[PDB]
RNA sequence: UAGGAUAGGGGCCUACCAUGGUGGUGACGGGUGACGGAGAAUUAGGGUUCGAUUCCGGAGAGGGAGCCUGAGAAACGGCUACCACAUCCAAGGAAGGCAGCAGGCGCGCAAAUUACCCAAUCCUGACACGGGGAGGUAGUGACAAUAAAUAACAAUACCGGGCGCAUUAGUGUCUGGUAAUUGGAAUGAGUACAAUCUAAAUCCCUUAACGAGGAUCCAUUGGAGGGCAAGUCUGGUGCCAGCAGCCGCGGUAAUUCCAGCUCCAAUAGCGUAUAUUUAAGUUGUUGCAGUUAAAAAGCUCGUAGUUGGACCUUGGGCCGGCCGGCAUCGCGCUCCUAGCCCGGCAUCGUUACUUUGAAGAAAUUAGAGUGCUCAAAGCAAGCCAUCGCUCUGGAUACAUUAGCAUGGGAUAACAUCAUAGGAUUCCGGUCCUAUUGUGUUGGCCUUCGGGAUCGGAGUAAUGAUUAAUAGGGACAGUCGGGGGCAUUCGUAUUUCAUAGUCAGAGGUGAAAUUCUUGGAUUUAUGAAAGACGAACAACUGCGAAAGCAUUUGCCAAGGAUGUUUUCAUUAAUCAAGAACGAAAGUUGGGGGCUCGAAGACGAUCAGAUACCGUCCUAGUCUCAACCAUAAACGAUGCCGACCAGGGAUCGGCGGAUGUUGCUUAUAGGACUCCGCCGGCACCUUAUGAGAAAUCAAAGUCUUUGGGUUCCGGGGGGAGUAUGGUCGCAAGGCUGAAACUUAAAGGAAUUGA
RNA sequence: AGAAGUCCAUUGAACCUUAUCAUUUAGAGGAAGCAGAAGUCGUAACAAGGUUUCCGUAGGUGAACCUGCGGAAGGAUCAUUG
RNA sequence: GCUCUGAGGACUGACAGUCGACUCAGAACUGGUACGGACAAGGGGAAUCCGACUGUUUAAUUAAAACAAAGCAUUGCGAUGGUCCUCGCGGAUGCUGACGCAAU
RNA sequence: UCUUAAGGUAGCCAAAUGCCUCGUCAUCUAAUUAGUGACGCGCAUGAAUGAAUUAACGAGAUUCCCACUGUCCCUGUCUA
C-alpha cells in the first residue's frame, strides 16, 4: 500500500488498450511539440503540461500521437527539468513545512510530517543519483533549498 | 510484496479444493506458463488460455478435477542430478505418481526428463 | 516467521547460535560451572569421613535417612554421602577413607532426601555391596 | 626509495620520506579441562558430539636464552649462561636433565615387566658380517571385539493336553517334568608322551595313556505394584528399619522393606556412576512456537543485511536409428584443428548454477574375489599326477567447500545506448618501426604491412520494452472531534457583595466531627476566578501510536475517491542510529474554582494506620525543560496473494424518476433504489483450523517452503546481583549465577 | 700462526621497583532467596471473597496492604426504540 | 663541552643572485659519571572533622570551625505608604515605585 | 493501660554532641585511653536552632604510610 501511511487505495488511471490515437486525433506531430515546448518555456512540468493536451487540445496521450514520452520530447530540446518533477515537488514541500514550523515549534505533529518527507526526499535521490539524474555530488541541503525553489 | 509462481500455483489448489471449473492468474510470465506445460502434459490440468491487454498479463486455466496439490518451493535450491532422489522422497507422495519441476539449462522440466537428459538445476515447484 | 532468503545463511547460523544458551541442557555443559561443582567432572571421588550424620525425610515419607558428611581429597569439598542400604551405616566410621560416587539424576536431589545428590559406594577399600552382602570382610 | 643481512623474497633490520593497515561480512581482546587433519560415536534423512594416542603436518625436551660442528640442528641420550630442583666431596672442587624402554615416588576415579632377541619389517656405518628398549616375542590384562561348553539319547513311569475306540473308555502321542529315578553311549575343560611351534622358549593347532552322576567338572548378575517380563505366596517389622531414576511402599492382614519359596529377563556375563548420542518436531535447514499455556518491540522513520513485478525466438521444422547434424530473415575471421567451393575460430561484460573429466595418501567407510573349519579378520590362495610347475589375484566406489579444465545457458545476481565519444566494405595525410631487391653487415626512404590519431563521403528498418488492481509525484472536488496560533461562548461550582426570612443545616446504614440568631442552610440580582465542555454522542469520524468533542479565523499537513496527467522499479522489512510517547513523577516560573496522595480529625471495629464522613498539602490547570513507562490490549508485527454468504454504516464516484416549506428556473442540496472503490465493525455458517474457548482469518500445515523484523524453550531465584550506559532524581535500557523444585500452567466437564 | 686479556656493538637470560590484569580467598556489620518445623499476628486473594480484580506511577502504614491519578476486562454489563 | 647534520625565511631580477636575526630536532667524539654543577627552585600518598569556593576579621597574645557570600525562605509597604532620622522646622531610602524599597 | 498540644518522623552517632567511658565488635600495632569502620534504651542527636551528603579548595583540627633527616641513641667539630 502507501509507502508512509496505511492506505491501501487503488485509485490511478487506466488507458486504454488501443496504442495508436483515436481516429479523431487529427494533429501533427511537429505541431505537438511547439505545444509542448511553449508549455516549457512557460515553465509548466511535464505533469501539467500532458493534464493542457488532455483538457484543451484534446490529445488522450503523448505516447500514442507523437511516440515519445513528454519529458524526452522536452529533454531532446534541451528543456528538461534540471531537478526532476517529482524530487522538485518534495523538496518544494519541505521548505514549506519548515517554514511552519519556525513559528510553530510546538507543532508535534508538523515536526512527524518532516521527517517523513527529507526521509521521502533522500530515497528519491539515491535512485536518481544512481540513474545520473543528479549530479553525484547533489546533496540534499536542509538550509538552502528555498533558493533552489520557488 | 510480489513473488509470482505462488501467486498461480496457491490459486489453483484454492480453486480446486473447492471444486471450481475455472482458475484466473493475474500476474502471468513465461516461467508460470512452463510449468502448466509441465502439468498439463502429464495430465494434471486442461488448456489454459493467455490474456493480453498489455502488462504482465493474465491467463485462465481450466481444471480437471485431478490435480491434488501443487506447490513452489521458494528459495530455489541447486540440484545436482545426483539428489533428485532426495527431493523426490520427501515432497512427493509416493514413488509412483508426482513430479518435481526443475529449471534447468536445457529448459524447465520435470525430474524425470532431468534424469534422462542427464541435468540437474533449481528446484521450482511439484505437483501430484 | 523464519527467515529463508537463499543468502541468508548468516543470519540463520547466528540465531541457532543465540538461541541455544535458552537450552539448560547446552547452557549447563557450556558454561564451565560444572568445573566449580565438588566432582569437577568426575564419575567418582576419594573423601575421607567427617562425621555420620542423618537427615530427615521430605514431608509426605517420614525416616532418619543415614549419610555420613565426608571431605573430598582433591579439593578439601565437604559434602553429605548416603549410606545406602539397611544398617550399613555401621560399616561407616570416623577418619576413614570412602568412594564417593553420584547418586543419580546427575547431579540433583535423589528421592524424598533433601539436599543429598552423592552416594557412598566403597569403605576402606572394600566394596560396600560386599560388605553388605558378606562376601568381602573389612 | 637506497642500503645492510640472509641461502634467498620481505620492515627482516637500518637511514630518509609519506600516512597509512584492520573492523557489525565482528577487527582488537577474553575463554578453551584447545595441537591440526586423516578420522570416531550416534545415525530414516538432515544432524549432534568426540578427535591426547600407532598415518601425515607441527611443536617441545625442567623454564628462558645463546651457540659450536656440520650438507642438514638454534640438537639437549651436544655445549655455554642464568632461573628452579637436586647428587657426590677428602669442603679445594666436580657432575647434571626418563614428554625414549622398564621401573619407583607423588597425584589422582583412573592404567602392565626393572623379562628375551635382532629371527621378521626396515634403518644405519668403512659395512654381505657391527648395532638397533626402532621393532618383534613372551609375562600382567573381563579396555573393546570373535567363535563357543555347562549335556544328548533311550526305555520305566504316580502321573498331564491331544491324537488311534472318543463312546465308557482310557493312557500314548511330541515326552513337557518332579524325577539324588535306571541303562549303557558322546566329548572336551583338565592332565600328559611326542612332534610341531619359536631367534630360543611358551600358547595355539595335531595327538600315546588317564579325564562325568549330577552332591559333582554345581552360572551369575539384576528384578517380581506400575512404567516393565515376572506372586492378590509365607514369617518379621510397624511412617521404625528400609526401599524408591519417577509415581510411590512402610502408622499390626506390607503384591514395594528384611527373609524363605517360586517365578522373570539377559547370560559368561550383568549392575552402578559420570560425559555424550538417541528418544528431541523439547533448538526445529529439512522441521517447533508467540490471542488465552513461555513468547509481537508503545509507535513510526531509517543505514547495513535479507528479499524484490512483467518483457528480449530459439519460436514454425528438414533430416536420419535421446541426439547429432541443419534450413528460417544463424556480425567475421588471416593465424592450430583446416571437405570431396565446405562444417567445427580463439580475445573488443563479468559470475553463480549444472554437466563431464583431471588430480586427488594410505589406514578407516562402502564394496568385488577368496571355505583363515565358521566369525571378527587377513590379502590371500586355488588347481595340478593338491610330482622339478602351472594359474594368478592384490578390483572398484564416496570424498562437503576452495582451486583447474569441458558443454549447457533455464534460473538469479553486478555492471551498462541515448551529449551517439555507436557499428560499418572503402577512401591520403598528419607518422614510426623494414621483410623478399641489402647473395655480407647494415642503416633514414617510393607503391607496400600494422600502430595510433584523424577530418569527409558511405551504408543500415540507422540505435530508448510496457506502463504492474508495485511505488512516488502532479491535478480536481471533497472529508474529518488529525495538528499548531489566536479567538467567541455555556451553565454549574467556589468566593464576594446586596436584599429577605428565621432555627436549624450538612452527612449517613445510623450518627458524629463541622457550620449556625456575629442570621447557618434556603431564596433572589450582580461580580470575580479558575477548571470543565452535559444532553446531541453511536457496536460513528480522524490520527503511527499515545491520543483527539463549545465558536470563528489563520498556518501548514493527510487519507480515500476521480483521472486516457507524469516518472519508470525508484520497492518490502529492517541490526546501528532517530521522531513522537496517557497517568504519575522532577526543576523553575504562572495560576491555585473543583477534586485531592500525604497529614489531621469523626465514625465503625477485637483493633482499623482502611472502606464511610469532615478538613486539607503536593498534585490537578498552564509556559519552559526532563522523564520514557501502562492490561501502552485486538494480550493478534509489517508487506503480498487466494479463499463464503448477507444486511447495515462512514468517505468519494457512477447510474436511475420523484419529492420538497427550498431554488429568478432547471442543476445541484435533503430523501428513495442500484453499482464500484476504500474504511470501522457486525451477523449466519463450515467444506477449514484449533487442546478448546473460539477464529471468515487464529483458514489455504506431516499433502509441512511468498518476503522480512522482533521474540519463547518446565516452575522459581529474578527483571534480582554485578558491570556498562542514559537521567537532576525517581528510575530506564542491557542483564546472570549459586541454589531450589514435580510440577506450575491453559481450555473445557460434573459436582460443591 | 697465535692464547689470556681487552674494546665497542648485538642477541639476551635473570633479578628488582612501580603499575596493571586475571583467577582464587578472609572480613565486624548490613541485607536477599530457599527449605524445615505440631509457632505468633492478622485476612490480602479465589464467590459481588463480603471495598470487583489487575497494570503503570506516587505517597503512606506491624504485616499481608491502603489511598490518589490515568488505564484494562483477564467483570459482576456483549443489551434502552423498553 | 666539542665537532657536525637537517628543517623552518626575506628581497631582487618549481630558477639565479644576495641577505638574514633567531628556534627545534638529530649524530659522533669527549671527561675521574660530570652537567637546572653557584643561584634559583613542589616532598608525596591513604583518610576523618568543619567551612562549599574567592573574600574578611580581634592595630600590640586569638586568622579560625568565627564574619561575609551566592543560593533558599519569610515579613511590611501602592505614596493620604513602609522602614528610619530630627528639639523643632523638616529630612534619608528617593534622580526611587513591587524584576522596587525596607526588616529578618 | 495512664497521659499529652504533639509524644522525636526521615535521617545521623561514644560525632567539635555519650555521664558511665579507656562503651562493645572489627581494623591499624610487637604493644594503641589515639585513628578509621560498625553497633545504638542516644546522661543530653535530629530536620532553614536546618537534617544527611558532598567534587574542588584551606598558613583550619586529627590518624596513618613512603621518602627525609643530629628530633633522638650521643654527642663531636667548624665559621662569624
Ligand atoms: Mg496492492
Ligand atoms: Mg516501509
Ligand atoms: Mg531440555
Ligand atoms: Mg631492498
Ligand atoms: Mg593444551
Ligand atoms: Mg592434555
Ligand atoms: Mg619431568
Ligand atoms: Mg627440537
Ligand atoms: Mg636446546
Ligand atoms: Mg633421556
Ligand atoms: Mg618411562
Ligand atoms: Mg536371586
Ligand atoms: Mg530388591
Ligand atoms: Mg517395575
Ligand atoms: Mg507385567
Ligand atoms: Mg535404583
Ligand atoms: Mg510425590
Ligand atoms: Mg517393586
Ligand atoms: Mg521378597
Ligand atoms: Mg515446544
Ligand atoms: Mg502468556
Ligand atoms: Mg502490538
Ligand atoms: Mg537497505
Ligand atoms: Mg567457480
Ligand atoms: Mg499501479
Ligand atoms: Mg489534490
Ligand atoms: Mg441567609
Ligand atoms: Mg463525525
Ligand atoms: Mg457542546
Ligand atoms: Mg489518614
Ligand atoms: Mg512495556
Ligand atoms: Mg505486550
Ligand atoms: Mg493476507
Ligand atoms: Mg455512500
Ligand atoms: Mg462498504
Ligand atoms: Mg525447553
Ligand atoms: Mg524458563
Ligand atoms: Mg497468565
Ligand atoms: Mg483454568
Ligand atoms: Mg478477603
Ligand atoms: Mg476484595
Ligand atoms: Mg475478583
Ligand atoms: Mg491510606
Ligand atoms: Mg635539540
Ligand atoms: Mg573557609
Ligand atoms: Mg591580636
Ligand atoms: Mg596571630
Ligand atoms: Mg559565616
Ligand atoms: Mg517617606
Ligand atoms: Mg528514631
Ligand atoms: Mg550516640
Ligand atoms: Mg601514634
Ligand atoms: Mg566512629
Ligand atoms: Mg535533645
Ligand atoms: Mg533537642
Ligand atoms: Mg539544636
Ligand atoms: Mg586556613
Known sequence: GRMHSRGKGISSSALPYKRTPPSWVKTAVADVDELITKAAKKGQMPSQIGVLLRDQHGIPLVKSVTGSKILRILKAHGLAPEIPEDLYFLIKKAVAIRKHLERNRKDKDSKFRLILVESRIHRLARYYKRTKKLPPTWKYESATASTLVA | ?128 | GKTRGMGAGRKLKTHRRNQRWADKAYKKSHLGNEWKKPFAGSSHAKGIVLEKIGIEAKQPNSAIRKCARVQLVKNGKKIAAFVPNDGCLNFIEENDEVLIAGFGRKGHAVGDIPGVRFKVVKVSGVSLLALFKEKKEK
Open chain 2, 1 to 128: 510484496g510480489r513473488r509470482i509462481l505462488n501467486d498461480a500455483l496457491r490459486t489453483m489448489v484454492n480453486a480446486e479444493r473447492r471444486g471450481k471449473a475455472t482458475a484466473q492468474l493475474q500476474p502471468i510470465s513465461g516461467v508460470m506458463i512452463s510449468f502448466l506445460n509441465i502439468m498439463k502434459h502429464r495430465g494434471y490440468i486442461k488448456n489454459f488460455e493467455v490474456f493480453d491487454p498489455h502488462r504482465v498479463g493474465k491467463i485462465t486455466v481450466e481444471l480437471q478435477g485431478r490435480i491434488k496439490d501443487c506447490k513452489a518451493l521458494t528459495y530455489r535450491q541447486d540440484l545436482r542430478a545426483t539428489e533428485i532422489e532426495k527431493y523426490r522422497t520427501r515432497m512427493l507422495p509416493t514413488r509412483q505418481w508426482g513430479y518435481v519441476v526443475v529449471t534447468t539449462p536445457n529448459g524447465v522440466l520435470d525430474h524425470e526428463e532431468a534424469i534422462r537428459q542427464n541435468v540437474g538445476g533449481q528446484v521450482l515447484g511439484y505437483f501430484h
